[PDB]
A = this chain, B = another copy of it.
Amino acid sequence: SLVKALQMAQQNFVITDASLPDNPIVYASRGFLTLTGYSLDQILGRNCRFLQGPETDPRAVDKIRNAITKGVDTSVCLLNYRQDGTTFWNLFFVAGLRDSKGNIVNYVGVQSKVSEDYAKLLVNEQNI
């Protein structure tokens, strides 16, 4: 009763269109704007990867990239950057929205800023 219990804050979510080449962001909640610091215009049309930066863990990025292309739902905690250049730890959950026949045309992303000590716990788990 933790990983899901805390993460439950859902006002931070995006929707992406997989039918467009780089699975770009087609919708972002105002909460996502608040969290990331970006305007709607500087988000829409872009792959969510733009939040990442120098100190972002590449091996973590690889894990979700694979999860997404394989269509499996997963969550991941990695280092993200705001509009201004500050960094927060992002625990986000990505889930593919399958049509009646099982094809993914949209994806849901739910983002969460997590504390330092919780991030350390989540990252170490990923290091296995």
Out of B15, B17, B97, name the residue touching A15 (CB < 8 Å): B15
**Binary interface profile of A, 94-109, with partner B (CB < 8 Å = 1, else 0)?**
0101111000011010
Report chain B residues within 8 Å CB of A91.
none
The answer on a CB contact under 8 Å between B26 and A110 is no
A98-B7 CB under 8 A given contacts A15-B15, A15-B27? yes
Q: Is A66 an interface residue (CB 8 A)?
A: no
The answer on a CB contact under 8 Å between A100 and B2 is no
A7-B95 CB under 8 A given contacts A19-B30, A26-B27, A27-B26? yes
Report chain B residues within 8 Å CB of A31.
99, 105
